[PDB]
Amino acid sequence: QLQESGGGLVQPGGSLRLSCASNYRMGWFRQAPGKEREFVATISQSGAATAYADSVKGRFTFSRDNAKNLLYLEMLSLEPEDTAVYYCAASSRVFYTEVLQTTTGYDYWGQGTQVTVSS
Numbered sequence: 001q002l003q004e005s006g007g008g009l010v011q012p013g014g015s016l017r018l019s020c021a022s023n024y025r026m027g028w029f030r031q032a033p034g035k036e037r038e039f040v041a042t043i044s045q046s047g048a049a050t051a052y053a054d055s056v057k058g059r060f061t062f063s064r065d066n067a068k069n070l071l072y073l074e075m076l077s078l079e080p081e082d083t084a085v086y087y088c089a090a091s092s093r094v095f096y097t098e099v100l101q102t103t104t105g106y107d108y109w110g111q112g113t114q115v116t117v118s119s
Contacts, residue, residue, distance in 0.1 A: 002088045006073075007113030014078050014117070020071040020088030020110060026064060027091060027106055028073050030084035030115075039101045040086070041073065051101065056082075078117045085112040 006018040020026070028040035040060065041052045047064040061074040071088060089106035099105040 002090060002108060002110035004086060004088050004110045004113035007086065007115045009116045009118065010078055011118050012079050016075045016078065016115060018073040018075065018086055018113060018115075020073075021069065022066045024090040024092055024107075025096075025100060026062075026071050027089040027100065028062060028071075029087045029089060029103065030082075031087070031112075032081075032084040037087075037103055038084075039103075042091075042096075042100045043071070044096065049096070051096075053101070075115070078115075080117050080119050082115065083117050084115055086115050087112045 003021045006016060010016060022045060025045055027042045029037050030040050031037040039053045040056055041062040043050050043062050043064055050062050052060060059076045064071045088110040090108040091100060091106045
């Protein structure tokens with residue numbers, strides 16, 4: 001069962017720290033107005049390996065704490081185009097492949113947290 005939090009409203013250049021409450025790879029996706037749901041980041045079961053969408057790489061950092069059943073997404077240097085509902089997702093796939101950068105790669109989904117970056 002997945003539930004996102006930490007969303008809110010920031011000005012451009014601001015930051016947010018999202019969270020989502022061990023056998024599953026985990027992912028973040030986002031869905032902006034008038035755009036298909038977009039991959040943001042994925043993380044391995046152990047938490048030691050990540051991959052990021054080009055649109056966020058260099059600004060976002062995805063981590064997990066297995067003991068606490070928690071995920072974190074640090075989002076720096078936010079811009080208006082980062083506005084979206086952000087979703088956490090769980091994948092049972094054992095090995096990493098490019099399918100983990102698609103919605104198809106995942107089994108379970110949270111309902112989302114709204115992130116708004118003002119114009």
